[PDB]
Amino acid sequence: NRYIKPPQSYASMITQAILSTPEGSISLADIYKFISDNYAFYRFSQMAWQNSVRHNLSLNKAFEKVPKGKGMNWKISDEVRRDFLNKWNAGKLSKIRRGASVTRQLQLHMSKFGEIPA
DNA sequence: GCGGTATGTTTACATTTCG
DNA sequence: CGAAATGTAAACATACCGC
Ligand SMILES: [K+]
């Protein structure tokens, strides 16, 4: 059973993990599990993808620690969530792709569930 | 009390993306 | 093409855990 590294970006998989929870907040440990559950490649891969995940959570503006026991929880920032909701309800979004990896996951979750968790 | 591990920040360079 | 974004590696801080 061979597995290939999916082309999805780390920020895209993280956004997916946060939107999967009912409260829109999730711990690093559960983000690891979500990735291994939904993308089998990372379940058995030896590379240090967790280092890259942590790098993306801290550096990407869209991800923000919530006070919320080893680690705290992560959610989508209020600025990025409020911004998307305003653009979503004000009309179609631009077809631009550069840097919209998080925006696309919000678009998908919104078109299926009608709301971004919080 | 200490060693060990998990979480989080930050910097640097390589690689891919896409107007 | 190339600025911007993402990928990968690394140094190191901070907190937690189990004894
Ligand atoms: K961040």
PDB file of C-alpha atoms (C1' of nucleotides) and ligand atoms in Angstrom:
ATOM      1  CA  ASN A   1       0.000   0.000   0.000  1.00  0.00           C
ATOM      2  CA  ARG A   2       1.901   3.016  -1.345  1.00  0.00           C
ATOM      3  CA  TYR A   3       1.048   6.611  -0.421  1.00  0.00           C
ATOM      4  CA  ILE A   4       1.990   9.901  -2.088  1.00  0.00           C
ATOM      5  CA  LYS A   5       2.388  13.242  -0.359  1.00  0.00           C
ATOM      6  CA  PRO A   6      -0.835  15.163  -1.095  1.00  0.00           C
ATOM      7  CA  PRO A   7      -0.344  18.550  -2.797  1.00  0.00           C
ATOM      8  CA  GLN A   8      -2.592  20.200  -0.191  1.00  0.00           C
ATOM      9  CA  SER A   9      -0.701  22.785   1.834  1.00  0.00           C
ATOM     10  CA  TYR A  10      -0.129  22.521   5.582  1.00  0.00           C
ATOM     11  CA  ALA A  11      -2.180  25.666   6.200  1.00  0.00           C
ATOM     12  CA  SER A  12      -4.990  24.100   4.160  1.00  0.00           C
ATOM     13  CA  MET A  13      -5.017  20.885   6.202  1.00  0.00           C
ATOM     14  CA  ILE A  14      -4.888  22.859   9.452  1.00  0.00           C
ATOM     15  CA  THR A  15      -7.871  24.994   8.435  1.00  0.00           C
ATOM     16  CA  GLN A  16      -9.658  21.742   7.609  1.00  0.00           C
ATOM     17  CA  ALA A  17      -8.901  20.386  11.094  1.00  0.00           C
ATOM     18  CA  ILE A  18     -10.172  23.516  12.837  1.00  0.00           C
ATOM     19  CA  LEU A  19     -13.407  23.644  10.830  1.00  0.00           C
ATOM     20  CA  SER A  20     -14.141  19.974  11.582  1.00  0.00           C
ATOM     21  CA  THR A  21     -14.760  20.633  15.291  1.00  0.00           C
ATOM     22  CA  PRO A  22     -18.109  21.922  16.601  1.00  0.00           C
ATOM     23  CA  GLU A  23     -16.495  24.835  18.474  1.00  0.00           C
ATOM     24  CA  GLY A  24     -14.015  25.779  15.754  1.00  0.00           C
ATOM     25  CA  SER A  25     -11.151  25.291  18.221  1.00  0.00           C
ATOM     26  CA  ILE A  26      -8.764  22.339  18.399  1.00  0.00           C
ATOM     27  CA  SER A  27      -5.519  21.370  20.108  1.00  0.00           C
ATOM     28  CA  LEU A  28      -2.232  20.699  18.349  1.00  0.00           C
ATOM     29  CA  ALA A  29      -2.471  17.054  19.375  1.00  0.00           C
ATOM     30  CA  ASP A  30      -5.861  16.693  17.689  1.00  0.00           C
ATOM     31  CA  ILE A  31      -4.639  18.541  14.583  1.00  0.00           C
ATOM     32  CA  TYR A  32      -1.954  15.869  14.278  1.00  0.00           C
ATOM     33  CA  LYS A  33      -4.649  13.194  14.584  1.00  0.00           C
ATOM     34  CA  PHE A  34      -6.961  14.884  12.069  1.00  0.00           C
ATOM     35  CA  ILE A  35      -4.159  14.956   9.499  1.00  0.00           C
ATOM     36  CA  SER A  36      -3.231  11.315  10.084  1.00  0.00           C
ATOM     37  CA  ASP A  37      -6.905  10.307   9.967  1.00  0.00           C
ATOM     38  CA  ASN A  38      -7.804  12.111   6.733  1.00  0.00           C
ATOM     39  CA  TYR A  39      -4.450  11.898   4.882  1.00  0.00           C
ATOM     40  CA  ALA A  40      -2.976   8.421   5.275  1.00  0.00           C
ATOM     41  CA  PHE A  41       0.410   9.526   3.909  1.00  0.00           C
ATOM     42  CA  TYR A  42       1.185  11.424   7.112  1.00  0.00           C
ATOM     43  CA  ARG A  43      -0.027   8.530   9.289  1.00  0.00           C
ATOM     44  CA  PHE A  44       2.983   6.411   8.257  1.00  0.00           C
ATOM     45  CA  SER A  45       5.445   9.037   7.002  1.00  0.00           C
ATOM     46  CA  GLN A  46       8.786   9.409   8.758  1.00  0.00           C
ATOM     47  CA  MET A  47       9.454  13.029   7.781  1.00  0.00           C
ATOM     48  CA  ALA A  48       9.089  15.716  10.452  1.00  0.00           C
ATOM     49  CA  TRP A  49       5.784  17.115   9.221  1.00  0.00           C
ATOM     50  CA  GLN A  50       4.773  18.007  12.800  1.00  0.00           C
ATOM     51  CA  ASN A  51       7.576  20.584  12.869  1.00  0.00           C
ATOM     52  CA  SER A  52       6.072  22.101   9.715  1.00  0.00           C
ATOM     53  CA  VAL A  53       2.570  22.083  11.211  1.00  0.00           C
ATOM     54  CA  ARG A  54       3.756  23.949  14.320  1.00  0.00           C
ATOM     55  CA  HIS A  55       5.677  26.358  12.092  1.00  0.00           C
ATOM     56  CA  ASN A  56       2.491  27.146  10.155  1.00  0.00           C
ATOM     57  CA  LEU A  57       0.289  27.576  13.229  1.00  0.00           C
ATOM     58  CA  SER A  58       2.579  30.191  14.777  1.00  0.00           C
ATOM     59  CA  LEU A  59       3.615  32.066  11.628  1.00  0.00           C
ATOM     60  CA  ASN A  60       0.321  32.169   9.710  1.00  0.00           C
ATOM     61  CA  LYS A  61      -1.848  35.103  10.763  1.00  0.00           C
ATOM     62  CA  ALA A  62      -5.023  33.060  10.275  1.00  0.00           C
ATOM     63  CA  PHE A  63      -4.275  30.772  13.248  1.00  0.00           C
ATOM     64  CA  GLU A  64      -4.576  32.041  16.810  1.00  0.00           C
ATOM     65  CA  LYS A  65      -4.214  30.487  20.252  1.00  0.00           C
ATOM     66  CA  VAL A  66      -7.325  30.546  22.440  1.00  0.00           C
ATOM     67  CA  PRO A  67      -6.807  30.333  26.237  1.00  0.00           C
ATOM     68  CA  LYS A  68      -9.044  27.248  26.447  1.00  0.00           C
ATOM     69  CA  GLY A  69      -3.874  20.494  29.394  1.00  0.00           C
ATOM     70  CA  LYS A  70      -0.376  20.217  27.944  1.00  0.00           C
ATOM     71  CA  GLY A  71      -1.172  22.595  25.090  1.00  0.00           C
ATOM     72  CA  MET A  72      -3.674  25.312  24.306  1.00  0.00           C
ATOM     73  CA  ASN A  73      -6.273  25.310  21.533  1.00  0.00           C
ATOM     74  CA  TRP A  74      -6.099  26.874  18.075  1.00  0.00           C
ATOM     75  CA  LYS A  75      -8.847  28.590  16.082  1.00  0.00           C
ATOM     76  CA  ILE A  76      -9.253  30.887  13.085  1.00  0.00           C
ATOM     77  CA  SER A  77      -8.453  34.487  13.948  1.00  0.00           C
ATOM     78  CA  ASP A  78     -11.382  36.854  14.395  1.00  0.00           C
ATOM     79  CA  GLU A  79      -9.922  39.243  11.821  1.00  0.00           C
ATOM     80  CA  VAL A  80      -9.594  36.533   9.158  1.00  0.00           C
ATOM     81  CA  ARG A  81     -12.999  35.045   9.989  1.00  0.00           C
ATOM     82  CA  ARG A  82     -14.761  38.422  10.072  1.00  0.00           C
ATOM     83  CA  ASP A  83     -13.022  39.435   6.842  1.00  0.00           C
ATOM     84  CA  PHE A  84     -14.098  36.291   4.989  1.00  0.00           C
ATOM     85  CA  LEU A  85     -17.685  36.532   6.217  1.00  0.00           C
ATOM     86  CA  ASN A  86     -17.919  40.125   4.992  1.00  0.00           C
ATOM     87  CA  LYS A  87     -16.562  39.193   1.557  1.00  0.00           C
ATOM     88  CA  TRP A  88     -18.733  36.064   1.419  1.00  0.00           C
ATOM     89  CA  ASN A  89     -21.943  37.976   2.152  1.00  0.00           C
ATOM     90  CA  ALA A  90     -20.991  40.940  -0.071  1.00  0.00           C
ATOM     91  CA  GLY A  91     -20.762  38.859  -3.256  1.00  0.00           C
ATOM     92  CA  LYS A  92     -18.574  36.312  -4.988  1.00  0.00           C
ATOM     93  CA  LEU A  93     -14.921  36.010  -4.013  1.00  0.00           C
ATOM     94  CA  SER A  94     -12.045  36.679  -6.385  1.00  0.00           C
ATOM     95  CA  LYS A  95     -10.752  33.757  -8.442  1.00  0.00           C
ATOM     96  CA  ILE A  96      -7.180  34.630  -7.421  1.00  0.00           C
ATOM     97  CA  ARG A  97      -5.299  31.644  -6.006  1.00  0.00           C
ATOM     98  CA  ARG A  98      -2.045  33.110  -4.654  1.00  0.00           C
ATOM     99  CA  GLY A  99      -2.165  32.986  -0.863  1.00  0.00           C
ATOM    100  CA  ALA A 100      -5.836  31.941  -0.736  1.00  0.00           C
ATOM    101  CA  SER A 101      -5.167  28.426   0.578  1.00  0.00           C
ATOM    102  CA  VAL A 102      -7.003  29.205   3.824  1.00  0.00           C
ATOM    103  CA  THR A 103      -9.746  31.134   2.008  1.00  0.00           C
ATOM    104  CA  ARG A 104     -10.568  28.122  -0.165  1.00  0.00           C
ATOM    105  CA  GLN A 105     -11.154  25.868   2.850  1.00  0.00           C
ATOM    106  CA  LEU A 106     -13.483  28.503   4.298  1.00  0.00           C
ATOM    107  CA  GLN A 107     -15.317  28.665   0.965  1.00  0.00           C
ATOM    108  CA  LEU A 108     -15.763  24.885   0.955  1.00  0.00           C
ATOM    109  CA  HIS A 109     -16.942  24.623   4.558  1.00  0.00           C
ATOM    110  CA  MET A 110     -19.318  27.561   4.097  1.00  0.00           C
ATOM    111  CA  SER A 111     -20.945  26.161   0.947  1.00  0.00           C
ATOM    112  CA  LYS A 112     -21.726  22.862   2.712  1.00  0.00           C
ATOM    113  CA  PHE A 113     -22.587  23.970   6.267  1.00  0.00           C
ATOM    114  CA  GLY A 114     -23.694  27.590   5.817  1.00  0.00           C
ATOM    115  CA  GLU A 115     -21.510  28.911   8.644  1.00  0.00           C
ATOM    116  CA  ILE A 116     -17.892  29.111   9.785  1.00  0.00           C
ATOM    117  CA  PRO A 117     -17.532  27.596  13.282  1.00  0.00           C
ATOM    118  CA  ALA A 118     -16.490  29.709  16.250  1.00  0.00           C
TER     119      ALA A 118
ATOM    120  C1'  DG B   1      14.552  18.157  42.095  1.00  0.00           C
ATOM    121  C1'  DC B   2      15.873  16.486  37.183  1.00  0.00           C
ATOM    122  C1'  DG B   3      15.561  14.462  33.038  1.00  0.00           C
ATOM    123  C1'  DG B   4      12.549  13.883  29.448  1.00  0.00           C
ATOM    124  C1'  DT B   5       8.974  15.296  26.226  1.00  0.00           C
ATOM    125  C1'  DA B   6       5.442  18.308  24.098  1.00  0.00           C
ATOM    126  C1'  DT B   7       4.193  22.933  22.654  1.00  0.00           C
ATOM    127  C1'  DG B   8       5.380  27.299  20.618  1.00  0.00           C
ATOM    128  C1'  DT B   9       8.310  31.072  18.555  1.00  0.00           C
ATOM    129  C1'  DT B  10      11.603  32.624  15.391  1.00  0.00           C
ATOM    130  C1'  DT B  11      15.141  32.794  11.714  1.00  0.00           C
ATOM    131  C1'  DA B  12      17.180  31.060   7.383  1.00  0.00           C
ATOM    132  C1'  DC B  13      17.376  29.155   2.987  1.00  0.00           C
ATOM    133  C1'  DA B  14      15.363  26.006  -0.705  1.00  0.00           C
ATOM    134  C1'  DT B  15      11.416  25.153  -3.638  1.00  0.00           C
ATOM    135  C1'  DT B  16       6.969  25.907  -5.741  1.00  0.00           C
ATOM    136  C1'  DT B  17       3.290  28.960  -7.077  1.00  0.00           C
ATOM    137  C1'  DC B  18       1.014  31.752 -10.552  1.00  0.00           C
ATOM    138  C1'  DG B  19       0.066  36.428 -12.502  1.00  0.00           C
TER     139       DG B  19
ATOM    140  C1'  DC C   1      10.240  35.721 -15.121  1.00  0.00           C
ATOM    141  C1'  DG C   2      10.165  36.686 -10.437  1.00  0.00           C
ATOM    142  C1'  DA C   3       7.831  38.486  -6.158  1.00  0.00           C
ATOM    143  C1'  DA C   4       5.194  36.039  -3.109  1.00  0.00           C
ATOM    144  C1'  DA C   5       4.010  31.881  -0.830  1.00  0.00           C
ATOM    145  C1'  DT C   6       4.970  27.532   0.722  1.00  0.00           C
ATOM    146  C1'  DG C   7       8.258  23.758   2.204  1.00  0.00           C
ATOM    147  C1'  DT C   8      11.795  22.236   4.999  1.00  0.00           C
ATOM    148  C1'  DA C   9      15.334  22.614   8.425  1.00  0.00           C
ATOM    149  C1'  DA C  10      17.056  24.294  12.579  1.00  0.00           C
ATOM    150  C1'  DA C  11      17.982  26.857  17.195  1.00  0.00           C
ATOM    151  C1'  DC C  12      16.010  27.468  21.314  1.00  0.00           C
ATOM    152  C1'  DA C  13      12.599  29.065  24.598  1.00  0.00           C
ATOM    153  C1'  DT C  14       8.669  27.576  27.617  1.00  0.00           C
ATOM    154  C1'  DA C  15       5.714  24.523  29.960  1.00  0.00           C
ATOM    155  C1'  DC C  16       4.320  20.227  31.309  1.00  0.00           C
ATOM    156  C1'  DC C  17       4.850  15.293  33.102  1.00  0.00           C
ATOM    157  C1'  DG C  18       6.208  11.281  35.695  1.00  0.00           C
ATOM    158  C1'  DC C  19       9.022   9.873  39.237  1.00  0.00           C
TER     159       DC C  19
HETATM  160  K     K D   1      -0.208  32.698  14.228  1.00  0.00           K
END
